[PDB]
Amino acid sequence: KFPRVKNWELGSITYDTLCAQSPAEQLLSQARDFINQYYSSIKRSGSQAHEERLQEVEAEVASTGTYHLRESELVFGAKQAWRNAPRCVGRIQWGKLQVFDARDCSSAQEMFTYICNHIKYATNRGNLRSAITVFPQRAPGRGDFRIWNSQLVRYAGYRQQDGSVRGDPANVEITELCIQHGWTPGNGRFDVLPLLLQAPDEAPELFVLPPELVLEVPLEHPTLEWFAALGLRWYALPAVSNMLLEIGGLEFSAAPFSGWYMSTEIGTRNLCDPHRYNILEDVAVCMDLDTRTTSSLWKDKAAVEINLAVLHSFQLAKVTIVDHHAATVSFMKHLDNEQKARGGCPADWAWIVPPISGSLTPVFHQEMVNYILSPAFRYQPDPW
Amino acid sequence: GPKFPRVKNWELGSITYDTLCAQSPAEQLLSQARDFINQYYSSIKRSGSQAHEERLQEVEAEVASTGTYHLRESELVFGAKQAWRNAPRCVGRIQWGKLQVFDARDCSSAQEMFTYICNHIKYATNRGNLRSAITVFPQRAPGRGDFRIWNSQLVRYAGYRQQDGSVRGDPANVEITELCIQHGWTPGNGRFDVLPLLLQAPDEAPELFVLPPELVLEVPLEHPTLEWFAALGLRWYALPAVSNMLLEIGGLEFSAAPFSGWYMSTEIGTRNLCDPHRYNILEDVAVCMDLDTRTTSSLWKDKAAVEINLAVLHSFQLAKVTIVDHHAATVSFMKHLDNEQKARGGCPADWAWIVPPISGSLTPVFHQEMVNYILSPAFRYQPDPW
Ligand code: HEM
Numbered sequence: 001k002f003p004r005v006k007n008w009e010l011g012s013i014t015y016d017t018l019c020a021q022s023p024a025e026q027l028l029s030q031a032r033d034f035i036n037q038y039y040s041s042i043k044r045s046g047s048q049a050h051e052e053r054l055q056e057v058e059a060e061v062a063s064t065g066t067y068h069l070r071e072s073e074l075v076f077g078a079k080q081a082w083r084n085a086p087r088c089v090g091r092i093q094w095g096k097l098q099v100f101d102a103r104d105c106s107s108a109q110e111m112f113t114y115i116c117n118h119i120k121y122a123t124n125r126g127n128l129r130s131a132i133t134v135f136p137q138r139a140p141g142r143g144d145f146r147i148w149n150s151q152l153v154r155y156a157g158y159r160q161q162d163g164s165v166r167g168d169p170a171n172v173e174i175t176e177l178c179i180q181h182g183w184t185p186g187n188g189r190f191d192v193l194p195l196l197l198q199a200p201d202e203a204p205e206l207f208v209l210p211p212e213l214v215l216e217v218p219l220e221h222p223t224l225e226w227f228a229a230l231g232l233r234w235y236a237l238p239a240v241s242n243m244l245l246e247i248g249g250l251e252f253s254a255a256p257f258s259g260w261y262m263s264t265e266i267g268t269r270n271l272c273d274p275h276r277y278n279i280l281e282d283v284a285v286c287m288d289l290d291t292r293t294t295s296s297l298w299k300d301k302a303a304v305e306i307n308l309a310v311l312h313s314f315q316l317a318k319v320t321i322v323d324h325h326a327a328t329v330s331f332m333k334h335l336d337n338e339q340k341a342r343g344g345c346p347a348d349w350a351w352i353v354p355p356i357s358g359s360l361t362p363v364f365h366q367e368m369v370n371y372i373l374s375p376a377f378r379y380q381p382d383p384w
Numbered sequence: 385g386p387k388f389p390r391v392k393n394w395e396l397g398s399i400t401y402d403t404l405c406a407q408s409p410a411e412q413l414l415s416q417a418r419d420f421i422n423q424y425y426s427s428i429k430r431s432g433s434q435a436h437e438e439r440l441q442e443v444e445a446e447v448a449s450t451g452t453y454h455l456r457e458s459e460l461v462f463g464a465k466q467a468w469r470n471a472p473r474c475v476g477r478i479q480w481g482k483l484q485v486f487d488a489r490d491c492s493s494a495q496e497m498f499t500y501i502c503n504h505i506k507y508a509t510n511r512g513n514l515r516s517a518i519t520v521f522p523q524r525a526p527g528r529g530d531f532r533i534w535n536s537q538l539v540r541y542a543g544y545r546q547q548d549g550s551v552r553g554d555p556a557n558v559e560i561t562e563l564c565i566q567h568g569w570t571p572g573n574g575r576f577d578v579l580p581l582l583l584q585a586p587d588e589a590p591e592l593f594v595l596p597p598e599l600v601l602e603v604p605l606e607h608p609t610l611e612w613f614a615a616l617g618l619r620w621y622a623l624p625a626v627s628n629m630l631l632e633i634g635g636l637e638f639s640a641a642p643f644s645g646w647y648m649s650t651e652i653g654t655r656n657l658c659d660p661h662r663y664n665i666l667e668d669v670a671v672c673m674d675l676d677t678r679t680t681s682s683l684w685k686d687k688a689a690v691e692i693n694l695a696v697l698h699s700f701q702l703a704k705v706t707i708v709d710h711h712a713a714t715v716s717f718m719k720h721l722d723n724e725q726k727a728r729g730g731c732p733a734d735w736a737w738i739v740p741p742i743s744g745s746l747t748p749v750f751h752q753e754m755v756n757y758i759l760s761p762a763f764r765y766q767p768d769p770w
Pocket residue numbers: 078081082085087088089090091093097130131132240257258259260261262265322327351377
């Protein structure tokens with residue numbers, strides 16, 4: 001059962017041998033395995049340090065049913081989780097990640113402070129830097145530390161009693177939850193949501209982000225003057241905050257991570273999805289395109305200009321962003337580095353190929369094997 | 385549902401369960417035959433009928449005395465349409481019930497293959513008002529050689545390896561171009577030389593047939609607003625007619641059974657014209673559009689690809705040759721998924737192949753999960769005859 005992996009452009013073949021790695025004694029084997037990975041990473045396998053670390057872990061599990069990671073191990077595990085993430089096109093960057101140890105956090109108030117520091121650090125005035133903040137691990141006793149928001153920065157979606165949405169339709173539910181916990185809403189298309197942060201077994205608490213922390217890019221087109229008139233904008237920092245970070249069998253239910261955007265995320269998905277902002281028709285009408293027939297390719301033309309406007313606007317504002325051609329070229333290089341380093345690379349083809357111009361990027365022609373290695377970022381249920 | 389795969393649409397939030405995938409030596413043949421006979425009797429709603437039981441008995445007796453069996457005409461038609469309906473990579477299946485089946489199971493020479501193929505091309509092309517069709521040559525037989533069409537499609541452009549390592553024409557067709565020459569063809573030297581057919585009758589060297597050029601409808605490509613685009617001298621043929629696939633029905637194997645529909649525009653505009661290892665015109669067109677080809681972030685690739693696709697659509701429309709854009713096609717495919725959910729409880733579909741190679745998430749199929757599996761009757765890949 002060993003997968004053959006073909007590139008259809010170049011006719012070349014690799015083999016993925018990494019996928020062969022795809023109660024209390026159960027946590028123990030995950031832990032050992034992770035400790036093994038860590039001491040191999042620093043070239044210290046078999047050392048006294050390695051053997052004694054394995055014993056602390058074993059001793060702690062045998063008597064408490066759990067254990068704790070050292071800071072340097074946490075840092076390693078976080079990088080490895082990103083590296084292992086099948087859906088991430090940005091993994092050429094995996095070794096470059098600021099890890100904020102937030103395991104000494106004991107209240108929603110403190111989560112907020114750590115989160116603000118993350119945003120400040122990550123944003124860096126537009127010169128974006130990848131970062132993760134790791135809050136305290138799950139404990140069999142009690143509730144989880146959770147950030148209820150799906151990203152640290154996201155726009156409200158206000159439902160109308162005629163079923164339409166003002167703002168982002170993806171965030172209707174979190175918006176409602178914010179109002180219910182006492183937030184007085186705005187009424188714009190691009191209102192930044194407050195944070196709902198929950199400490200163990202408490203009601204979540206509401207925290208408004210200080211506006212100067214949230215860097216935003218107004219969208220304009222390099223040649224179409226009317227584009228600025230649409231009043232569109234997007235935030236600088238993509239910071240996923242609902243995913244669970246699993247390292248050595250330990251689970252970090254709150255561990256938000258950020259990098260920078262690939263342009264199609266905003267340009268195509270966020271702005272053109274019919275269940276998101278759905279601006280395709282507006283732009284095409286502005287461009288004076290024939291909307292009445294699919295065969296004018298009015299959708300394709302509008303979409304390209306919208307993506308161009310996103311790149312232009314971010315570059316104008318000096319905010320780090322990567323276009324889908326550049327991002328996929330570098331993913332190809334990453335795939336190649338990982339073949340030499342680990343003998344394969346978990347990748348989810350349907351997520352890696354961009355949502356416009358698929359076959360124009362080299363990843364479209366590249367077969368990919370999807371599998372789950374640990375450390376991992378995993379989905380977890382919403383806390384309500 | 386239970387342990388039927390749950391299938392979600394992310395655009396509308398809706399859920400279906402696929403219940404169809406539950407049906408995914410000589411004894412081998414018999415049970416495939418019986419399963420197919422059962423399917424044929426469902427489709428005419430006579431399961432358990434006396435004629436159903438007689439057909440089953442008739443088939444086991446034929447396999448018993450000969451090691452093989454033969455299809456009634458109407459079974460062949462049902463089986464061909466069903467192979468199309470089951471084809472996971474086909475985005476055009478809304479059309480599956482409208483298929484002209486030419487029965488060519490009496491064919492006995494390569495010369496007769498050519499006559500049948502010419503008839504097929506004439507009928508399917510129909511001066512631009514294209515009609516789906518398949519021509520079925522005789523099935524594999526124990527001890528005797530196969531009927532094969534060596535060409536991958538009935539209509540394909542030559543690809544000539546140059547002195548300097550580059551390719552003139554279509555690089556996808558270098559190997560078949562060279563076989564035609566090995567077998568006696570005098571090669572041209574254009575970018576768009578229609579290949580001759582190499583056709584093989586049982587236990588015989590393939591023979592070479594040149595298609596009369598008036599049977600091969602082509603469309604010159606022009607752009608509705610970019611006047612210079614016509615000057616590129618680009619063109620494409622009207623008729624996509626896959627010829628190298630095996631049609632399997634009830635365990636019988638039709639090694640030569642070419643089928644044709646009409647094009648969806650991205651097949652030509654994006655894959656055939658813009659793939660780096662095909663005609664690779666992306667950069668040439670962007671230069672003519674005066675785009676900045678030195679930087680990825682001008683989106684020159686995306687812009688040129690759109691205009692090439694628009695050129696294809698516009699030009700086919702102008703020539704009054706049937707073609708479908710990737711929006712119309714994917715919309716019709718969603719409607720097919722809905723029909724099939726009701727008819728059969730699911731639809732085998734290969735997401736990677738169904739989502740078009742440009743503007744993916746702009747089409748509804750991007751947001752639709754799909755389950756991939758093999759049902760029979762089927763179109764199958766088969767080894768090249770050489
Ligand atoms: C450095 C810049 C980065 C770029 C350009 C990038 C690019 C992307 C893109 C385009 C996606 C698909 C997301 C979607 O369609 O919603 C993605 C997913 C993901 N990336 Fe990244 N990435 C970056 C950094 C990071 C970092 C720092 C991490 C964490 C350490 C990370 C982990 C992930 C994970 C776990 C997913 C899956 C998210 C999900 O399932 O919703 N990436 N990445």
